[PDB]
A paper describes a structure:
The HIV-1 Env glycoprotein, a heavily glycosylated homotrimer containing gp120 and gp41 subunits, mediates entry into host cells to initiate infection. The viral entry process is initiated when gp120s bind to the host receptor, CD4, at the CD4-binding site (CD4bs) located distal to the Env apex on the sides of each of the three gp120s. This triggers conformational changes in gp120 that expose the gp120 V3 coreceptor binding site, which is occluded in the prefusion conformation beneath gp120 V1V2 loops. To investigate the role of receptor stoichiometry in CD4-induced conformational changes in HIV-1 Env, we designed soluble Env heterotrimers that can bind only one or only two CD4 receptors for comparisons with Env homotrimers binding either zero CD4s (closed, prefusion trimers) or three CD4s (fully saturated CD4-bound open trimers).
We used single-particle cryo-EM to solve structures of the BG505 HT1 heterotrimer in the presence of CD4. We found three classes of HT1 heterotrimer: class I (132,550 particles; 3.4 Å resolution; density for one bound CD4), class II (68,508 particles; 4.2 Å resolution; strong density for one bound CD4 and weak density for a second bound CD4), and class III (260,558 particles; 3.2 Å resolution; no density corresponding to bound CD4 molecules). Owing to heterogeneity (class II) or no bound CD4 (class III), we fitted CD4 and Env trimer coordinates to only the class I CD4–HT1 reconstruction. We found that binding one CD4 primarily resulted in a closed, prefusion Env conformation that showed only subtle indications of CD4-induced changes. However, the HT1 heterotrimer used for the structural studies here did not include mutations that lock Env into a closed, prefusion conformation. In the CD4bs region of gp120, the CD4 BSA footprints were comparable for class I CD4–HT1 and CD4–BG505. The class I CD4–HT1 complex showed an intermediate orientation of gp120 β20/β21 loop residues, with the N425gp120 and M426gp120 side chains oriented similarly to their positions in the CD4–BG505 complex, whereas the W427gp120 side chain adopted a position similar to that in the 1-18–BG505 complex. Thus, whereas the overall conformation of the Env trimer in the class I CD4–HT1 complex represented a closed, prefusion Env, the gp120 Phe43 cavity showed indications of structural changes consistent with CD4 binding.
Numbering used by the authors:
A (entry chain Z): 1 to 176
B (entry chain E), E (entry chain D), F (entry chain F): 519 to 546, 569 to 663
C (entry chain B), D (entry chain A), G (entry chain C): 34 to 57, 65 to 78, 82 to 136, 148 to 185, 188 to 309, 312 to 321, 321A, 322 to 397, ...
The structure:
């Protein structure tokens, strides 16, 4: 069961697999068997799902046997498993959307405390591994806090989150 | 030897002696496909006639005698006038409108003879 | 009596089949692709009905010739970049003044973004001015010009039309056969005698002559709208030449593109003309009128006039020989009124942009042929057309018509007919299968 | 008992072969190549297992139609020179507001070194602007447009698919045949019936009506990803027309190469629409609901909703009406909820540079006013997947896969190969 | 008269009466090559059956008796219920897993019968 | 089973024993035309041999002795040595110059036989 | 002793016929259209006359390969707009100095009236300057360039030539066969195995080896005008690659037509080099020279020199591994005099505009291969050409030649021969028909 990780705003390319290397009719559905996208001959039809304005498939890739599912403007509620039905299979992948940010946007002082906000999807167990230029490779749970804030603590912290051996790098805004 | 269609004017009795001559000549890009389809058409035209011969129980025989009685409604002329005066062309023109029923009669007679032979051999 | 099945009887029926070709540089008719040839078997006692006007072979050969012409022009250069504005001037180096144009135009080069100011000699019939003046190619607003490949020769090579296995071709051998009605002397020959696919009008060139008497053959001799195919018994040789010494010049109009344009004429400019023996033509016209009198009365005045009007192909004697397409005004041949050493010179005009089969949107550019062309041919028949009489006039006027190529190919496929062998027959006898 | 050889016995096996056309002036579906048509023999005491959804005949016909369309387009004009910058303005001679664009471009005349300033009316769905504004052809950066020759016609002419010698076509005459399973009344035909190769989505047109009631056939009715082909018994007439009095203007884009472009719209500008009898359509939808409740229960609410979305050829009822390619918004048709004189007007849109259902082909404007009346002989519904806890089944019109249009006419047919050589034991023995 | 495949549901004995009806129907751009290839395929498929008939000593025959014993392993059914209740499709389905063995047996029996024949005729 | 033309080095008796396998192997885009015309050529080449066999009165028989005697010499030798050691290829090489005459004699003899049988069958 | 008829007799006659293909991603050679392959029969006491230099299978294979090559180039991009003036500069990121040219040219976009200034890298052999400097493609004045389809592969997929029904292919299994004369051990296989349509010169790559010792096969060992097909028993592995990390960039020539340029390079620029194990090559050359001493005498000095000269395709060893065409300089291979762990490196050169079959007016642009190309093959034969001597010298110089692809494919179809079966046999036998 393949699993991929999002960044709450970027795109994700979940790919079906076709053994005949041709335009076999396929259909993308979530865990509730609600149609999202689908091939109909040479045209594209979108199901009555919550991804009407976001879901899209690279129509030029259908000839080779690749039927991706492009999901633009990822949202936290979009985290669910998705199914292919290329010929008779159930090629199933799971999408996890992680939202990591901080409440203190810009208003910070020297010697203060810093707090982060991670929005994990319901039904997941994330592990955040922060990385900093000065070397505070902070390890902790979903919520991370920093107690020391000085002029040396500037620089973007590439705080990335782990779950099921899969890792996705983030960026944060730090201006001092 | 009269050659291909050489006896087309000779009487039926005289033209029935050179049936092999008219039988051996029945089988052997703009021009390329024309040649290919001519070959295929010739093969089909030969094979349909051979199948018709083989269905009436006359495969491989030029002159086959069969059991279908000659109904007098097709031609009332005697053999002395048919096999000594007319050639094959006017004969084919004469009975050209009664040939399908003759072919069907031959087909049915051959099938009946085949079944009778199989029944006879089982005793 | 009992029916008996005879296989291989000499019985045939009229049919239409796809006859193939057979014949003994690469040619425009692709006669090399035909199967090598090798025949005639007399059929005594038989009478067969022939009809050359309902002969499917003439239509089959017409379609075959059209397809062969169109197939050999696919791999040739497409002269689309020729359709430019030409700045032409009169050539001066007799009566050919105002006939050849010295056209200088902007032409592309091997490099896409580079140009090349070249010049060429175009005949007056190849260019129409735009309204020194500005001209353009004549077939530029209606057709796409495709230059004929220089290594493909338009020579009429004899081809034989052989019927496939199971079919036979009957050949009427009656020496006075008029193209319709039974032939009391029929023969079965596998391949045709060899028909030269020559394209011409008003004069059947290099054709097969009649045996005894000049034959007049028409579908309805009383109908004026049907052409009157004449066939001679002795040939009237015609001497055709192009005195101009053409020089061919190659112009590169693209990567691997070679447009061949007329260069500078080496010497003097003279009209291309066709020479015909005057005494021989007069005697042949006398024989033609003598036999033609049989269909209109012995007191009929038979008159010959020039063409009525239309395109240059039907108005003048158009023919191709040597690679240059002539268009010979034939008003010098048909001017006589027949009641109860010297030679005739016919001025000819040469064209290069041709649309042979009257097709819309397709044309051909025949590249110039180097050197002076001399061309000897036989006139073995005419294609006359009787004008509409007043039904109360004693004079009959005949003007050379034509233009339908099927009329040309009907004069060679007139004695021929394809039949389908029906070797399976049924006949009664005293047989009985045991 | 000895082995006896029988040649010519009625024995067949399922097989796939090349079936040739036999049609009943040029058409995109060749009429100068199909052999002239010439018959039906009932087969008592036989039950043959049919299958619509794995039938090779639909795939073969799809390939044949694709090859015919891609072959009748090769000798046609090529419209690559049309890829220029089009200075375009709105026409203002109410619904068709900003939908007809009055473009004007520089185009090469018959002479290579001269230019010509011509103008043509392009539909809004056919030009995308580059940021009078500058536009360009819609299918200009991904495909080459070849104009359809005006002398060939997209008229659906019936074609009979005959099997070659040695093969037979079995025709299931069971009037309650749902497309899969044993057919208790099988007949043999030399050729299939007249199959009008109509191209349409969301609404099967011009098909063969089914007898008895409105038959519903699906590959897997429980699956929510299979087109639920519906076939009517009483056809509902549809009246589609384009009120504009269009005129065709010819532009010379090359030597001997013309380009027929929309000129001036004589008279008023009005929207292309389609009319369907509201009462007749309501009755037909009621019959479809009655026959559809059998597969989902009697108490389940059957609901019809318009197309969910996607490419214009799926989300709108697209068809060819006399040459112009309509795209009709059928939201007013499939809009109801069924629980246990007036005409519906569909605002259609016309495209010229359409994308083929295979490269794009430009349909030249049709001179005059177009009107056509057609039979709606079936739908292509796609069910919406449920949560297994709701008593509603919303059906939305699908289609677009052109094999489904021809699978509603090749459902009763099946190709078999005759195997006449048989062996059986008898008491006979050769001497 | 029933027509092509007319006796497809009839019993074996009753369907064996109409072999000629199914016998004579075995021979007769985008559409042009489809026509040509289909014609060649039909000719080849008919010639295959004819050659199989020829090497069994059954050439030019519809009902041909042979010398190979019918082993009860292939089918234990008696003649009554074979030729009076079953249909040719059912019989083909039952013995479809033994056709190659029977064809090979017919082949070898035919060749031994032939070689015995030339042995006999040498006297 | 010496193989397809496997017995070409064996004695003519051994080759005549295994004629059946050679008889069964005589029938069964750039590559497309080479495939189609190859099939057409194979079909017509097999049909020519079958037809030549047919008009000699040897239809469907791998071995068919006929009435035409060994005229002149035609490399007569004797029946013992020819079928004991000599191979088929050498034998074809010896009489390659009289084959057409042999075929013509066979054709006329078969036509005579058919005419005589038709004559005697009417008694 | 009357005439008896036998059918199915094993007799054959040598004849020529069309043989189809059987093959066990699309390719230029359409193995997908070939029939699926499946059978080897030995023939006792058979003596068959073979001839490798009069074999029609060689010409048939050459024609088929050419047709498959130029068929796959039809639906692909045509690079006519590329024939423009290119402003080129030396790449300068090394022995490959000037051999990679950085060229920028005006270019058409999806809109006909909008120009675009793109750049692409061209090898020095692919561009010729016109007197930064102005350059043009090497084949802008002779041929029309047709870019090879990116998806279509040039990988040699084995094909099998199966004769049609009624024909047999006789496969000589003699292990000491010099290509001409009777082969006293023949077999019969309906198809041909181990046929790979590889294109190369001076070195037969990925071929079928000899069985026991190196075979010298020539039509005329005395006439120096003919080639000398040498075949190896033990393969000489060749290791070579293109170390440059190429990047493919897509440039629009127009609507729906992409020109896959050479983009840019990543890393250092290194010459394409072919490596052969020096010990292996030395041993193979010793065996080969021992073989040639048989036909020229033991005390005869054998000298090996590089190619005499001519076109780059015949001057240098030119294969097509990985989709990129190499032109390796084999002067370091044939350089020795024979008297009675290190690897030699070959400085290859790479072209992209190729005219493979010496055809005038048709060329092909090979799209650049992204990444790094490495191909390992092993040399199974050579094509040597003995130079004309003065008939009084002790030395004999053997320079590699080739250029005729038929000479390459004759190294595979040498052991086969197509025959036509004559299964109808007349003979005398003690029978009289009743
Ligand atoms: C002689 O035969 C050898 C072995 O088949 C040939 O080498 C092979 O060349 C192909 C073509 O490039 C290689 O396939 C390619 O592999 C790359 C990854 O390396 C992949 O991205 C491509 O899509 C393609 O599949 C193949 O790996 C290679 N095999 C070996 C063992 O090196 C060689 O080209 C032949 N020589 C000639 C002159 O034909
Ligand atoms: C032609 O007919 C006459 C009289 O009927 C006859 O004597 C002659 O033999 C016939 N010739 C041929 C060749 O049939
Ligand atoms: C060329 O000669 C013709 C002959 O009358 C004349 O009408 C025409 O004006 C001349 N053209 C020029 C440019 O002098
Ligand atoms: C035609 O030219 C030839 C030369 O080939 C000559 O012999 C003949 O007399 C000429 N005839 C006429 C009528 O000029
Ligand atoms: C007629 O034939 C002669 C010689 O074969 C040839 O010189 C001449 O060009 C031909 N005429 C035509 C119109 O083809
Ligand atoms: C018309 O015929 C007369 C006969 O007197 C002749 O003088 C004149 O030249 C002819 N007209 C032509 C050939 O144009
Ligand atoms: C034309 O119609 C479009 C579409 O509504 C509109 O945006 C635009 O303002 C109108 N006027 C012009 C000059 O484009
Ligand atoms: C459609 O038009 C036809 C012909 O005018 C008419 O008979 C029919 O009633 C119309 N139906 C509708 C729904 O407009
Ligand atoms: C079908 O079966 C019935 C029952 O035996 C029989 O009477 C009838 O003849 C059969 N029909 C056919 C066509 O075989
Ligand atoms: C570029 O390379 C060429 C070829 O060697 C050379 O002649 C030229 O001097 C080089 N240019 C520079 C600037 O070095
Ligand atoms: C090839 O070998 C044959 C016999 O094995 C011999 O007669 C012939 O001369 C040889 N030719 C060459 C070129 O080696
Ligand atoms: C090298 O030759 C050997 C000899 O059998 C062969 O197995 C191998 O495949 C050859 N190398 C390649 C790359 O094919």
């Amino acid at each position: 069961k393949k699993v991929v990780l999002g960044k709450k705003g970027d795109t994700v390319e979940l790919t079906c697999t076709a053994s005949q290397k041709k335009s076999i009719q396929f259909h993308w559905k979530n865990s509730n068997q609600i149609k999202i996208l689908g091939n109909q001959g040479s045209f594209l039809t979108k199901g009555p799902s919550k991804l009407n304005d976001r879901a899209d498939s690279r129509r030029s890739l259908w000839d080779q046997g690749n039927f991706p599912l492009i999901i633009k403007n990822l949202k936290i509620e979009d985290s669910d498993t998705y199914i292919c039905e290329v010929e008779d299979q159930k090629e199933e992948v799971q999408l996890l959307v992680f939202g990591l940010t901080a409440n203190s946007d810009t208003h910070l002082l020297q010697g203060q405390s810093l707090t982060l906000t991670l929005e994990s999807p319901p039904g997941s167990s994330p592990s955040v591994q922060c990385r900093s230029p000065r070397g505070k490779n902070i390890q902790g749970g979903k919520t991370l806090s920093v107690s020391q804030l000085e002029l040396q603590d500037s620089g973007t912290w590439t705080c990335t989150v782990l779950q099921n051996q899969k890792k996705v790098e983030f960026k944060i805004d730090i201006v001092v | 030897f009269l050659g291909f269609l050489g006896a087309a004017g000779s009487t039926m009795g005289a033209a029935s002696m050179t049936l092999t001559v008219q039988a051996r000549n029945l089988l052997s890009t703009v021009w390329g496909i024309k040649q290919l389809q001519a070959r295929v058409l010739a093969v089909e035209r030969y094979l349909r006639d051979q199948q018709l011969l083989g269905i009436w129980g006359c495969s491989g025989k030029l002159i086959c005698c069969t059991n279908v009685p000659w109904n007098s409604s097709w031609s009332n002329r005697n053999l002395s006038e048919i096999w000594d005066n007319m050639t094959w062309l006017q004969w084919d023109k004469e009975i050209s409108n009664y040939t399908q029923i003759i072919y069907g009669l031959l087909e049915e007679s051959q099938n009946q003879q085949e079944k009778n032979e199989q029944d006879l051999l089982a005793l | 009596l009992w029916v008996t099945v005879y296989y291989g009887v000499p019985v045939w029926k009229d049919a239409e089949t796809t006859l193939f070709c057979a014949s003994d540089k690469h040619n425009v008719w692709a006669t090399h692709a035909c199967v090598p040839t090798d025949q005639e078997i007399h059929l005594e006692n038989v009478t067969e009905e022939f009809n050359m006007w309902k002969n499917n072979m003439v239509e089959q050969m017409h379609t075959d010739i059209i397809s062969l012409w169109d197939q050999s022009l696919k791999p040739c250069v497409k002269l689309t970049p020729l359709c430019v504005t030409l700045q032409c001037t009169n050539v001066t180096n007799d009566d050919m003044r105002g006939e050849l144009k010295n056209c200088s135009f902007n032409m592309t080069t091997e490099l896409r973004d580079k140009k090349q100011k070249v010049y060429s000699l175009f005949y007056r019939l190849d260019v129409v001015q735009i309204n020194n003046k500005e001209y353009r190619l004549i077939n530029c607003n209606t057709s796409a010009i495709t230059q004929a490949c220089p290594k493909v020769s338009f020579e009429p090579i004899p081809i034989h039309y052989c019927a496939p296995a199971g079919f036979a071709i009957l050949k009427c051998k009656d020496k006075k056969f008029n193209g319709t009605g039974p032939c009391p002397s029929v023969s079965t020959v596998q391949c045709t005698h060899g028909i030269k696919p020559v394209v011409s009008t008003q004069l059947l060139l290099n054709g097969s002559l009649a045996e005894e008497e000049v034959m007049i053959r028409s579908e309805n001799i009383t109908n004026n709208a049907k052409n009157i195919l004449v066939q001679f018994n002795t040939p009237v040789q015609i001497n055709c030449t192009r005195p101009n010494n053409n020089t061919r010049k190659s112009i590169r109009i693209g990567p691997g593109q070679w447009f061949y344009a007329t260069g500078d004429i080496i010497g003097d400019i003279r009209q291309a003309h066709c020479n015909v023996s005057k005494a021989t033509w007069n005697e042949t016209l006398g024989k033609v009128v003598k036999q033609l009198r049989k269909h209109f009365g012995n007191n009929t005045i038979i008159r010959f006039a020039n063409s009525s009007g239309g395109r240059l192909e039907v108005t003048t004697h158009s023919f191709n020989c040597g690679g240059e397409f002539f268009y010979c005004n034939t008003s010098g041949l048909f001017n006589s009124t027949w009641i109860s050493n010297d030679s005739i010179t016919l001025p000819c005009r040469i064209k290069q942009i041709i649309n042979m089969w009257q097709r819309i949107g397709q044309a051909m550019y025949a590249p110039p042929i180097q050197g002076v062309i001399r061309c000897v041919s036989n006139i073995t028949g005419l294609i006359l057309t009787r004008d509409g009489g007043s039904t109360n006039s004693t004079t009959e006027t005949f003007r050379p018509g034509g233009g339908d190529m099927r009329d040309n190919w009907r004069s060679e496929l007139y004695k021929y007919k394809v039949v389908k062998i029906e070797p399976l027959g049924v006949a009664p006898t005293r047989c009985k299968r045991r």
